[PDB]
Structure 1
Amino acid sequence: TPTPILRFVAVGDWGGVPNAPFHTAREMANAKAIATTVKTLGADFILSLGDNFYFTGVHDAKDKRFQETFEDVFSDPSLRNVPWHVLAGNHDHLGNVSAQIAYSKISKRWNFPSPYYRLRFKIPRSNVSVAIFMLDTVTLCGNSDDFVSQQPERPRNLALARTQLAWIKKQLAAAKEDYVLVAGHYPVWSIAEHGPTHCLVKQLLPLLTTHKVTAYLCGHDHNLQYLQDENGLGFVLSGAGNFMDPSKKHLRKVPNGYLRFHFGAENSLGGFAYVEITPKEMSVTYIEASGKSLFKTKLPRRA
């Protein structure tokens, strides 16, 4: 009988441009590649890994950019009723992030109830559950655009950062699901221009290790990377919806052997990741906007 499966696309840093035509050729190519993937292989939902609207987000919930950069761009019929689950990046927080949360009630497929939140999924016709914790790494660690270094040196509100961290610790300690995923804009590990996010390495990584998280999904660096540590924890970096950056500036800031796949060709149109979860395993497939498949690897069921 048909294998039970939950499928989703994880695209990051897709948020167009504030000048006409409010998209890039890369966003357009990825919206069409995503449509082909959902049409042929299927998607239960799409996960945005932040930087939803370059370069200063939206002003309010009626901002025209919602139509120009998001709705009209991802408009192939095959994407019509695919829910999106959203989190925010640094450029979103240069603007009005409550506007993006409030847009949840304007557009059906846009789901973004709060800066951070938990998603729960059962795989159909199985007892296998999936948990996804959507983080706001900007309020946890600070806006990278607030610093010349562009590395978030500290959060702007101590109570918020502490509150969200206590929330993560609690949720992760009690999460009994078969696969547990954590997502946020900033990378834990990354070999590229931004590199590892010290705040997440020091505060988030230990929790991911203690509670046996399946994978951490992120964007922020504008390319595609798979990383994996000695404990089997996977790092899915998908930040190539709009830009492609071949930098390897931080290659030796990531522990030796972590990097398992990297693609950042400056002339590529970008890409995204395709996650398939069965009772057997979780698979991640990196797909170039050219429709090409670049890399596939598997992560085991937890506890």
Structure 2
Amino acid sequence: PTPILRFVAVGDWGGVPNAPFHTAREMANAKAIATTVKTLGADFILSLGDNFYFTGVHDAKDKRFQETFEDVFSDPSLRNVPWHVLAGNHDHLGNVSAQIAYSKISKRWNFPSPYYRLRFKIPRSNVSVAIFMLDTVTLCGNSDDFVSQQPERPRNLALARTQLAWIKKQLAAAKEDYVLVAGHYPVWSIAEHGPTHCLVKQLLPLLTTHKVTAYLCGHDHNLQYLQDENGLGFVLSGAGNFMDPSKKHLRKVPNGYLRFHFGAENSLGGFAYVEITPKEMSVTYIEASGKSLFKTKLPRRA
């Protein structure tokens, strides 16, 4: 066969704080992710943040971990698939240290620190993949701290500077055949929040300079694929719980960058399915109904 690494990227799936602690959308995506894993396989699942609506969890023993996560994603095919997690703005209104500590309670939950590096070998090959999981809230500010619901400035300047220095160092030294970067906030998005100026200003030049394959995010509650004139990809998968049809920020993205968008208000949402082989990275957007909406490939760089 062809060596392949496969994973699901889902964002903004965090249910609700009132009973039954999930939405119809979250359950449809849990069912649809289970079908994809059953039929096509997943080595892991990437959460793009906003893991517990609307104010996160209060400590590692918070019931929401079982009510909104464990019990929800409980279908047989999903039961032992590892999750690699980062935080969104609603998580940061609550206790993010609790979500990190929860890694030692639940085997499949992996969240060792606010930001960190993942390394993978495509099985049966020497081809390698690095994913850098970012905390865009501590870097840019918590959008929910502001009436604008934009991340206007970071809560702690040292922590922000420290993370940016780490990204810069890691991206310059990364030797892997594929490099992905993931964060809750978008770089580009046509939808209700739109582009994050903090990330456009500070992260995007690093993605370009160091030849990153793609940036993955959620935060806007819809599905988008964007690509710039250099081939850098932007996978936005933020439709695990909510579907916002907004195109408020369409004119804030450079012309031609938007290659796909799905935001239908009546849809149950969806997620992204990533396949990386020694020849290409493929991304398939899958609606909670099971249907494939869009597929695109990003070539390997030598």
Q: Same fold (TM over 0.5)?
A: yes
User: Structure 1 residue 241: deviation in Å?
Assistant: 0.1
Is 1:180–1:302's contact at 8 Å kept on the other side of the alignment? no
Is 1:9–1:43's contact at 8 Å kept on the other side of the alignment? yes
User: SS state of the match for residue 285, structure 1?
Assistant: strand
User: SS state of the match for residue 230, structure 1?
Assistant: coil
Is 1:11–1:49's contact at 8 Å kept on the other side of the alignment? yes
Query: What CA deviation, in whole Å up to 9, does each residue of 1:159-200 have, x standing for no partner?
Result: 000000000000000001001000000000000000000000
Alpha-carbon distance between aligned partners in 2 of 1:125 and 1:180, rounded to the nearest angstrom: 19
User: SS state of the match for residue 73, structure 1?
Assistant: coil
Alpha-carbon distance between aligned partners in 2 of 1:148 and 1:227, rounded to the nearest angstrom: 28
Alpha-carbon distance between aligned partners in 1 of 2:94 and 2:101, rounded to the nearest angstrom: 14
- 1:163 maps to what in 2? 162
Query: What CA deviation, in whole Å up to 9, does each residue of 1:191-236 have, x standing for no partner?
Result: 0000000000000000000000000000000000000000000000
User: SS state of the match for residue 216, structure 1?
Assistant: strand
Alpha-carbon distance between aligned partners in 1 of 2:152 and 2:208, rounded to the nearest angstrom: 23
- 1:244 maps to what in 2? 243
User: SS state of the match for residue 262, structure 1?
Assistant: strand
- 1:270 maps to what in 2? 269
Alpha-carbon distance between aligned partners in 1 of 2:52 and 2:215, rounded to the nearest angstrom: 22
Is 1:182–1:215's contact at 8 Å kept on the other side of the alignment? yes
Is 1:186–1:219's contact at 8 Å kept on the other side of the alignment? yes
Query: What CA deviation, in whole Å up to 9, does each residue of 1:36-56 have, x standing for no partner?
Result: 000000000000000000000
Alpha-carbon distance between aligned partners in 2 of 1:41 and 1:72, rounded to the nearest angstrom: 23
Alpha-carbon distance between aligned partners in 2 of 1:61 and 1:176, rounded to the nearest angstrom: 35
User: Structure 1 residue 302: deviation in Å?
Assistant: 2.4
User: SS state of the match for residue 68, structure 1?
Assistant: helix
Query: What CA deviation, in whole Å up to 9, does each residue of 1:216-261 have, x standing for no partner?
Result: 0000000000000000000000000000000000000000000000
User: SS state of the match for residue 33, structure 1?
Assistant: helix
Count of residues in Structure 1 that have an aligned counterpart in Structure 2: 302
User: SS state of the match for residue 272, structure 1?
Assistant: strand
User: SS state of the match for residue 161, structure 2?
Assistant: helix
- 1:190 maps to what in 2? 189
Alpha-carbon distance between aligned partners in 2 of 1:302 and 1:108, rounded to the nearest angstrom: 34
2:105 aligned with 1:106, yes or no?
yes
User: SS state of the match for residue 31, structure 1?
Assistant: helix
Query: What CA deviation, in whole Å up to 9, does each residue of 1:117-168 have, x standing for no partner?
Result: 0000000110100000000000000000001111101101000000000000
Is 1:93–1:143's contact at 8 Å kept on the other side of the alignment? yes
User: Structure 1 residue 301: deviation in Å?
Assistant: 1.0
Alpha-carbon distance between aligned partners in 2 of 1:253 and 1:173, rounded to the nearest angstrom: 29
Residues 187-226 of structure 1 mapped to structure 2, 5 A cutoff: 187-226=186-225
Query: What CA deviation, in whole Å up to 9, does each residue of 1:282-301 have, x standing for no partner?
Result: 00000000001000000111
Alpha-carbon distance between aligned partners in 2 of 1:212 and 1:121, rounded to the nearest angstrom: 18
Alpha-carbon distance between aligned partners in 2 of 1:150 and 1:197, rounded to the nearest angstrom: 11
Alpha-carbon distance between aligned partners in 2 of 1:50 and 1:251, rounded to the nearest angstrom: 23
Alpha-carbon distance between aligned partners in 1 of 2:299 and 2:185, rounded to the nearest angstrom: 24
User: Structure 1 residue 32: deviation in Å?
Assistant: 0.2
Residues 1-303 of structure 1 mapped to structure 2, 5 A cutoff: 2-303=1-302
Q: What CA RMSD, in Å, does the superposition of the two structures yield over aligned residues?
A: 0.3
Query: What CA deviation, in whole Å up to 9, does each residue of 1:69-126 have, x standing for no partner?
Result: 0000000010010000000000000000000000000000000000000000000110
Alpha-carbon distance between aligned partners in 2 of 1:151 and 1:73, rounded to the nearest angstrom: 30
Instruction: Give the fraction of aligned pairs with identical amino acids, expressed as a percent.
Output: 100
User: SS state of the match for residue 17, structure 1?
Assistant: coil
Alpha-carbon distance between aligned partners in 2 of 1:125 and 1:286, rounded to the nearest angstrom: 26
Alpha-carbon distance between aligned partners in 2 of 1:160 and 1:135, rounded to the nearest angstrom: 12
Give 5+ residue unaligned stretches, structure 2.
Answer: none
Alpha-carbon distance between aligned partners in 2 of 1:270 and 1:231, rounded to the nearest angstrom: 29
Alpha-carbon distance between aligned partners in 2 of 1:220 and 1:252, rounded to the nearest angstrom: 19
User: SS state of the match for residue 242, structure 2?
Assistant: coil
> Structure 1 residue runs of 4+, over 2 Å off?
none
